[PDB]
Amino acid sequence: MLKRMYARVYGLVQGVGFRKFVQIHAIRLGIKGYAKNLPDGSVEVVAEGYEEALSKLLERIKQGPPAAEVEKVDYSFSEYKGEFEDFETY
Ligand SMILES: [Cl-]
């Protein structure tokens, strides 16, 4: 089943390779969407893909690359919209 996920990642998560980390792992998993740095120092992820793939990505996002310290991930699933054609960072 396809689903959409919105997640916010908090901690030491900017300037540590986090968005690229999410992208690499999303692409591996066939997930489309984006990882964005927000002005509050958090990372916003919108992801579309299969439920299992989204669970695997969530497990990655909860850890981050070695340099990151992820304190909190707040997320929700919603209905798939077929919006994205690739996984981008910005
Ligand atoms: Cl980062």
UniProtKB/Swiss-Prot annotation:
Presence of the UniProt keyword Hydrolase in the record: yes
PROSITE patterns per the UniProt record, alphabetical: ACYLPHOSPHATASE_1, ACYLPHOSPHATASE_2, ACYLPHOSPHATASE_3
Keywords: Hydrolase
Dependence of activity on temperature: Optimum temperature is 81 degrees Celsius. Thermostable up to 100.8 degrees Celsius. Poorly active at 25 degrees Celsius. Enzymatic activity is increased 4-fold by temperature increase from 25 to 45 degrees Celsius and more than 9-fold at 98 degrees Celsius.
Domain of life: Archaea
UniProt family annotation: Belongs to the acylphosphatase family.
Protein name: Acylphosphatase
Organism: Saccharolobus solfataricus (strain ATCC 35092 / DSM 1617 / JCM 11322 / P2) (Sulfolobus solfataricus)
